[PDB]
Write an enzyme that holds these catalytic residues in place. Structure first.
Site, PDB file in Angstrom:
ATOM      1  N   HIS C  53       5.632 -13.418 -11.011  1.00 23.28           N
ATOM      2  CA  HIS C  53       4.321 -12.995 -11.481  1.00 23.28           C
ATOM      3  C   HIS C  53       4.436 -12.856 -12.984  1.00 23.28           C
ATOM      4  O   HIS C  53       5.528 -12.629 -13.506  1.00 23.28           O
ATOM      5  CB  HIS C  53       3.930 -11.636 -10.896  1.00 23.28           C
ATOM      6  CG  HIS C  53       3.848 -11.614  -9.404  1.00 23.28           C
ATOM      7  ND1 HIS C  53       4.950 -11.401  -8.600  1.00 23.28           N
ATOM      8  CD2 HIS C  53       2.790 -11.732  -8.567  1.00 23.28           C
ATOM      9  CE1 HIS C  53       4.574 -11.399  -7.331  1.00 23.28           C
ATOM     10  NE2 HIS C  53       3.267 -11.591  -7.283  1.00 23.28           N
ATOM     11  N   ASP C  56       6.163  -9.683 -13.697  1.00 23.07           N
ATOM     12  CA  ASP C  56       7.605  -9.711 -13.421  1.00 23.07           C
ATOM     13  C   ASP C  56       8.388  -9.996 -14.700  1.00 23.07           C
ATOM     14  O   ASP C  56       9.418  -9.369 -14.956  1.00 23.07           O
ATOM     15  CB  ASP C  56       7.964 -10.765 -12.360  1.00 23.07           C
ATOM     16  CG  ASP C  56       7.488 -10.394 -10.975  1.00 23.07           C
ATOM     17  OD1 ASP C  56       7.340  -9.197 -10.677  1.00 23.07           O
ATOM     18  OD2 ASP C  56       7.253 -11.301 -10.163  1.00 23.07           O
ATOM     19  N   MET C  87       6.969 -22.120  -8.981  1.00 25.04           N
ATOM     20  CA  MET C  87       5.729 -21.430  -8.652  1.00 25.04           C
ATOM     21  C   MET C  87       5.531 -20.176  -9.474  1.00 25.04           C
ATOM     22  O   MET C  87       6.491 -19.471  -9.769  1.00 25.04           O
ATOM     23  CB  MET C  87       5.691 -21.086  -7.159  1.00 25.04           C
ATOM     24  CG  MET C  87       4.438 -20.350  -6.708  1.00 25.04           C
ATOM     25  SD  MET C  87       4.613 -18.576  -6.821  1.00 25.04           S
ATOM     26  CE  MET C  87       5.190 -18.235  -5.130  1.00 25.04           C
ATOM     27  N   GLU C 180      -2.899 -17.965  -0.487  1.00 27.97           N
ATOM     28  CA  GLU C 180      -2.136 -17.157   0.457  1.00 27.97           C
ATOM     29  C   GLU C 180      -2.979 -16.099   1.168  1.00 27.97           C
ATOM     30  O   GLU C 180      -3.297 -15.065   0.594  1.00 27.97           O
ATOM     31  CB  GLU C 180      -0.972 -16.486  -0.263  1.00 27.97           C
ATOM     32  CG  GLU C 180       0.076 -15.946   0.697  1.00 27.97           C
ATOM     33  CD  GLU C 180       1.320 -15.448   0.001  1.00 27.97           C
ATOM     34  OE1 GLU C 180       1.325 -15.359  -1.241  1.00 27.97           O
ATOM     35  OE2 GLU C 180       2.294 -15.115   0.708  1.00 27.97           O
ATOM     36  N   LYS C 182      -3.720 -12.969   3.942  1.00 24.93           N
ATOM     37  CA  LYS C 182      -3.060 -11.816   4.542  1.00 24.93           C
ATOM     38  C   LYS C 182      -4.145 -10.997   5.229  1.00 24.93           C
ATOM     39  O   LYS C 182      -5.223 -10.824   4.667  1.00 24.93           O
ATOM     40  CB  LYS C 182      -2.389 -10.981   3.457  1.00 24.93           C
ATOM     41  CG  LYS C 182      -1.523  -9.853   3.989  1.00 24.93           C
ATOM     42  CD  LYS C 182      -0.884  -9.039   2.856  1.00 24.93           C
ATOM     43  CE  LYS C 182       0.206  -8.102   3.378  1.00 24.93           C
ATOM     44  NZ  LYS C 182       0.768  -7.268   2.278  1.00 24.93           N
ATOM     45  N   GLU C 216       2.328 -17.224   4.814  1.00 24.62           N
ATOM     46  CA  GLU C 216       3.515 -16.362   4.862  1.00 24.62           C
ATOM     47  C   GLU C 216       3.752 -15.854   6.268  1.00 24.62           C
ATOM     48  O   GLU C 216       2.847 -15.298   6.880  1.00 24.62           O
ATOM     49  CB  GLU C 216       3.352 -15.170   3.930  1.00 24.62           C
ATOM     50  CG  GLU C 216       4.412 -14.127   4.122  1.00 24.62           C
ATOM     51  CD  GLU C 216       4.710 -13.368   2.863  1.00 24.62           C
ATOM     52  OE1 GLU C 216       4.698 -13.992   1.777  1.00 24.62           O
ATOM     53  OE2 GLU C 216       4.943 -12.141   2.954  1.00 24.62           O
ATOM     54  N   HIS C 219       2.672 -12.228   7.143  1.00 20.33           N
ATOM     55  CA  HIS C 219       1.227 -12.030   7.079  1.00 20.33           C
ATOM     56  C   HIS C 219       0.545 -12.318   8.407  1.00 20.33           C
ATOM     57  O   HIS C 219      -0.180 -11.486   8.952  1.00 20.33           O
ATOM     58  CB  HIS C 219       0.623 -12.913   5.983  1.00 20.33           C
ATOM     59  CG  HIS C 219       0.968 -12.470   4.594  1.00 20.33           C
ATOM     60  ND1 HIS C 219       1.828 -11.426   4.335  1.00 20.33           N
ATOM     61  CD2 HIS C 219       0.571 -12.930   3.387  1.00 20.33           C
ATOM     62  CE1 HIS C 219       1.931 -11.252   3.027  1.00 20.33           C
ATOM     63  NE2 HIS C 219       1.176 -12.153   2.429  1.00 20.33           N
ATOM     64  N   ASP C 244       6.005 -19.299   2.504  1.00 21.27           N
ATOM     65  CA  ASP C 244       6.706 -18.051   2.251  1.00 21.27           C
ATOM     66  C   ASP C 244       7.369 -17.601   3.536  1.00 21.27           C
ATOM     67  O   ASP C 244       6.718 -17.468   4.580  1.00 21.27           O
ATOM     68  CB  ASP C 244       5.741 -16.977   1.756  1.00 21.27           C
ATOM     69  CG  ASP C 244       5.438 -17.098   0.270  1.00 21.27           C
ATOM     70  OD1 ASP C 244       6.138 -17.844  -0.442  1.00 21.27           O
ATOM     71  OD2 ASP C 244       4.508 -16.413  -0.199  1.00 21.27           O
ATOM     72  N   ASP C 254       3.760  -4.332   6.245  1.00 20.37           N
ATOM     73  CA  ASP C 254       4.464  -5.545   5.878  1.00 20.37           C
ATOM     74  C   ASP C 254       5.926  -5.194   5.599  1.00 20.37           C
ATOM     75  O   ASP C 254       6.238  -4.574   4.589  1.00 20.37           O
ATOM     76  CB  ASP C 254       3.792  -6.145   4.633  1.00 20.37           C
ATOM     77  CG  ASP C 254       4.366  -7.500   4.230  1.00 20.37           C
ATOM     78  OD1 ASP C 254       5.277  -8.026   4.920  1.00 20.37           O
ATOM     79  OD2 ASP C 254       3.883  -8.050   3.213  1.00 20.37           O
ATOM     80  N   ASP C 256       8.629  -7.490   5.316  1.00 20.88           N
ATOM     81  CA  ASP C 256       9.365  -8.492   4.542  1.00 20.88           C
ATOM     82  C   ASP C 256      10.871  -8.508   4.836  1.00 20.88           C
ATOM     83  O   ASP C 256      11.683  -8.449   3.925  1.00 20.88           O
ATOM     84  CB  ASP C 256       9.153  -8.274   3.045  1.00 20.88           C
ATOM     85  CG  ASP C 256       7.755  -8.645   2.591  1.00 20.88           C
ATOM     86  OD1 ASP C 256       6.981  -9.235   3.390  1.00 20.88           O
ATOM     87  OD2 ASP C 256       7.448  -8.349   1.416  1.00 20.88           O
ATOM     88  N   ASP C 286      10.089 -14.846   0.574  1.00 13.54           N
ATOM     89  CA  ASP C 286       9.343 -13.679   0.090  1.00 13.54           C
ATOM     90  C   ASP C 286       9.702 -12.458   0.930  1.00 13.54           C
ATOM     91  O   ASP C 286       8.965 -12.052   1.834  1.00 13.54           O
ATOM     92  CB  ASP C 286       7.827 -13.920   0.142  1.00 13.54           C
ATOM     93  CG  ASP C 286       7.022 -12.797  -0.533  1.00 13.54           C
ATOM     94  OD1 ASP C 286       7.554 -12.087  -1.420  1.00 13.54           O
ATOM     95  OD2 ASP C 286       5.837 -12.635  -0.188  1.00 13.54           O
TER      96      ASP C 286
END
Lengths: 387, 387, 387, 387
Positions: C53, C56, C87, C180, C182, C216, C219, C244, C254, C256, C286
């Site tokens: 991002h 980030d 990406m 994406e 969710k 994802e 998700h 993802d 979530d 992950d 992810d």
């Protein structure tokens, strides 16, 4: 090389392999199998025993004369084959009489009916050598709360459970009573929804020592709950009297899939729990073949339940013997004995010692428990990349 | 005309209205409120009391000198306002020390830490007049089952709960202990997941009479379970010592919505259950304002919880007085006394009478229970079309 | 022997391995890792690339002078290591400005902000070699429907998506845009909740050819939906531009989890779908390490994602080559060519032939499809009992 | 004062009120109702029309001679009563032929059968005045992914849908085709699981303008998805051709409860969406009475669906007229026109203006949207405390 032996105690309900494949949107895809026929087939497959509801063997409205030829011919088959009947249970869900409850019907005539149906199934069970009596409260729930019936149902089921246990000890039956929770279906919600719910109820009965649990994998999983945690609690209470094994995708109708077919990792750690706990009761497969199957597919379903259990058993055994695994478990179960005497039963000076103790907090803050490596190891064993 | 009075016993945790609106994907949207400030505000709103974690009032790493000015100034505010502090609870989830459990950490130093943290919050509670001590096991669960820790955790929590109850009676504290289940989050699964799970555990403690339940609406609802059934069981066991009220959409993260905002019908029949049971403990709103809100919206959230409770209370009262409703409940709780002496406690001749009894089955097969009409009546009352 | 190569196209977001382990009930358990540091580590591990991002790399409120030293030193690391940045994606969830939506905020100033933030991340991406731009609409949902905003949000996101695509083609950027979905979290419900939802929206944009999907695993699984079905639809539409990868238990927050760690069978058939479809985009993990982990555990998490993928890939390959499996698939994909000319595109006489055709219904009624055997074969391959 | 009129367009499927109350664990609790009988009853109740499956009217294996007396006597009843038949749909779920799919069966003979069954129901529909043809893909899913069939099913359903649309235009039928998604049941997962899924498929058919959606409240809610968001997307696409109305508790079997009986707030904002959008299609109640009901209870179910709809309609109307509500919506839909010219369609200088624009970020950071007050207002209207 994963062949079922009687010491494995694999059982099938008559209704599991005998399922005709009707569902709420579909006709039956299979023929009804004769009970004697399925005794011979399960014997061939290596099954320890067969379970039944009263109505599995003797359909509602069979004259006692005919009732007796049926039971006679079934017992011969069991004799011929050496199959046991470890578990029976009264069908308290099919009769329209039970539309708003068996034991929790508001109509005392219907609660009486549910009762008498239970006593009669206890009698059939004893006539067949049964040792475990299962109570599945499938019709005991509500979709309309406006009745206030949720306040009343606890006493109502205490009453027959207590009456059932007294009748058994009066007749000199040896039944242990196994209670089976389910969170919903066929009712929008069923009152006795969880393992914990049934565990708590037991402590209010008159002869609690006679009562335990029959948890079913699909039931807990239907609600997204962890079946391994639930079975651990029942084991720690000493109340695992029977277990119903199958598979299920979370949060939908009860699928009753072949065991291990969907959640391999959960089935793995469940077989590990059971085996390493020294559980000695039946391993029942309360599951049916997929609706896409003919009779051949039914027996491939049966064979696959038992074979998958035996594969995981062997695999969990090898996992626990791995040096790296043992080294990992050792490091994280690490106990400093200076920490331990602050622990365990109360004393005034233990409390004072604790409150003055200088704890190693920053060291425990930074601590990693290496569960990612441990979890990857188990997945690689499951995958047979290490086994 | 729906204004909160102290006899309503509405409480707010410091952390509810004080929530800064941070979430796993977002920054804080609000300022941290001073505890003295929120006592004055909740007093204005008509709250009976305020709850707290130790770290709500005294942040980790506050020198005892400063710890005491804080507690001093808080008590003055409570004095000024007449607010109670009915409930305290040790924060056993935030410290990184608790990353793999408080009481169920494998490290005995960490279990000691969890312990001492609890004793110290019991002491603060007593210094503030607290009567209920809550245990939320938020960090007690697993995502890696390969450890086999599920076998161990039951003894580990028995030990501190027992130690905590003994310390309390030693110090002459009057705490009742209230256990709060949650099915998951922050852990993939939490061991003590259900109301029934905590009910069953209580029966294994040394001083069970000191221990009860704090069920939370959102916790049970997260797993699609019926909160009204769960609370009825706790009431029937005599173990409802506290209740956490909020709202939640099923099967996702814990939302902690304003009470009654999402499931009106469930909130309705819950308020009905509590009130008509003569429950006398606190009505706690463990909920926060939406993240779209400023401080004004926080106090509208607080006002709305209590007002919605009072509206439903009045409504459930009127529903129960409706003639047609009374006529409907009468007909379906209908009991034939000839059915009733087949019922209730066991006797050899009661069993024989039952098994020979000629039951009115076809009559009970055809029987409709009129729950569609009853359920429509309650919806129309809820909608105020009848109230 | 399952070692990652660049042709595998394994990528990690900076925020995956860089996750400090804060959650809604807990502090950070780890140190923040320097971006240059994590580029060198991922290079060591065998990663094709790293995603980010904007925030980030460049935290909100960094002066452009300092913004440029950061980007300079990051590009050097990428040069040194040969890592790609496949990406990028604008963080439209953290800033409190986005409390009630990025693109779907009611305030046009906030929609402008979301916009500009996207353009600037497109610019950074180009400066770094990025080819895929991902849009995750995490803040685009509601908990209060009383606003009627659900009617408006479709046009609002069409507008910036269209504007973003036009800006890109104007600047001569080569971005494909990957959307994406969710189902919820951080919002009670997110508007673009499913793969199908985002697929349908694409067909209403101005330059649809520039737009595809980033599904994802966690998700879709959060809502109990089948990820394999969802990815098949995206593949059949030609819209799988990125994927993802991670793990998740159904119907909760979530998680992950590490890839393949929870649902082995789903991960199996997913890797099979991707590989045998000739999908050529990035395999992004992810996911973050468990909160019980230190930095060592983070890199074991990273290594485990990739290794688990490679094991399944090899395994699905072997499964498809099994003679019995081939024989089973052949028998059930069996096509009678007399059935086939009743099929396929419409003609008046094809309809008439069909309606007069004498169909072999009883034969198809009795037909079993042997999916229990096929399913047991796949489980035994998964378990490595056959591999 | 909430009495159904034909302009309300309330319809009931023959199978809704005609449901005999059989479920997967229980016998039928009711008698099968004659189709002519239920046409007269629904006419009495104030229903615009009645829907049917082919097999609701003409059971499988009825000779064409008898097929025609049936259809004759049904049409007379419709004539006598003035009831319409707005919608028909081929039963593609009951026949055992469909055990592994109708359109997505791997056997081309079975896909042909599914086909012909559809064409024949289209013919019956036209003979009865039907305008909407519904496709529910109940049997189109999988529990065994090892087949790889997920890759194939998209073309297979394109093919008949395209063939069906061509047959209709060839015959001069005026059918619009309405596609009904469901996430699971009777299949473990159904391929066309969501509203978005069916929306995306439509854009790949040959005559897309003939095809829309029939979303069902229970279907989306089964998976914990927001039905109001899904219906808004269908409306925004112009594809809401029909709607199936009922109630459901999330994450379990399909309950088909009376409309509005469980989720009042969702039903409220749904009726609001439909009405204020100017939707003009049928309001179908695809629901059945509780299994605790006799025939009286069935008609109380039917009456209650329609009455609950009319109460909410009136209520949502009054809610939208409230001054405080209007004042609240105005303030948050507040648009600064200086923000707006940064918006809308792309231009090189609009992008440059945006990137140089000085945005009022701190003001938007502090902004509260007052949705807690708005949400409390709507709950108080729902409760009739304000209506």
């Amino acid at each position: 090389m994963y062949e079922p032996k009687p010491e494995h105690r694999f059982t099938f309900g008559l209704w599991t392999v005998g399922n005709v494949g009707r569902d709420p949107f579909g006709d039956a895809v299979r023929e009804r199998l004769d009970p004697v026929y399925v005794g011979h087939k399960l014997a061939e497959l290596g099954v320890h025993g067969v379970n039944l509801h009263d109505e599995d063997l003797i359909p509602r409205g069979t004259p006692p004369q005919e009732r007796d030829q049926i039971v006679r011919r079934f017992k011969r088959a069991l004799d011929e084959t050496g199959l046991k009947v470890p578990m029976v249970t009264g069908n308290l869900f099919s009769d329209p009489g039970f539309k708003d409850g068996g034991f929790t019907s508001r109509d005392p005539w219907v609660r009486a009916y549910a009762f008498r149906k239970s006593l009669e199934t206890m009698d059939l069970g004893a006539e067949l050598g049964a040792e475990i009596y299962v109570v599945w409260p499938g019709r005991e729930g509500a979709e309309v709360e406006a009745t206030g019936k949720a306040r009343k149902v606890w006493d109502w089921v205490r009453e027959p459970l207590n009456f059932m246990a007294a009748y058994a000890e009066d007749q000199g039956y040896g039944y242990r009573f196994a209670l089976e929770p389910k969170p919903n279906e066929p009712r929008g919600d069923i009152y006795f929804a969880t393992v914990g719910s049934m565990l708590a109820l037991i402590h209010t009965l008159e002869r609690p020592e006679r009562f335990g649990l029959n948890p079913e994998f699909a039931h807990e999983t239907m609600a997204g709950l962890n079946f391994v945690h639930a079975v651990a609690q029942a084991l720690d209470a000493g109340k695992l009297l029977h277990i119903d094994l199958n598979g299920q995708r979370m949060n939908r109708f009860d699928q009753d899939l072949r065991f291990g077919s969907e959640n391999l990792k959960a089935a793995f750690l469940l077989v590990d729990l059971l085996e390493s706990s020294g559980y000695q009761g039946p391993r029942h497969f309360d599951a049916h073949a997929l609706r896409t199957e003919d009779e051949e597919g039914v027996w491939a379903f049966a064979r696959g339940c038992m074979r998958t259990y035996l594969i995981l058993k062997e695999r969990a055994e090898a996992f626990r013997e791995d040096p790296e695994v043992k080294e990992l478990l050792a490091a994280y179960y690490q106990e400093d004995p200076a920490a331990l005497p602050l622990m365990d039963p109360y004393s005034h000076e233990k409390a004072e010692a604790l409150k003055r103790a200088e704890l190693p907090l920053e060291a425990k803050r930074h601590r990693g428990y290496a569960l990612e490596r441990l979890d990857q190891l188990a997945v690689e064993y499951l995958l047979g990349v290490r086994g």
